[PDB]
Amino acid sequence: GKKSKATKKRLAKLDNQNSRVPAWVMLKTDRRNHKRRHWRRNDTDE
């Protein structure tokens, strides 16, 4: 499949949203990424 520029920006964003909650937020809140999406297990849009 051939992706467009906008489709690429969205996929790019979804990949960034897939990073873990930083180590410092755990210490600041004194103690979970609920939007964890896998390439196989989960499904994106379009």
């Binding site: 969205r10 849009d45 379009e46």
Partner: protein
């Protein structure tokens, strides 16, 4: 051929995509119409009274 599992293999067509207007994955790229907000069909937004209970 079974209508079940062996007919699922042919399913690689892309139809419903992210809509420019509402953001929902309902823009039918072959019909150029959105099944959620009515983009491509109407200037007005697709809303219906049956989307909620009669007295609500």
């Amino acid at each position: 051929t079974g209508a079940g599992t062996p007919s699922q293999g042919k399913k690689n067509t892309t139809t419903h995509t992210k809509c420019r207007r509402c953001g929902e994955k309902s823009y039918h790229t072959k019909k150029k119409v959105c099944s959620s907000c009515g983009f491509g069909k109407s200037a007005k937004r697709r809303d219906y009274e049956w989307q909620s209970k009669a007295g609500e």
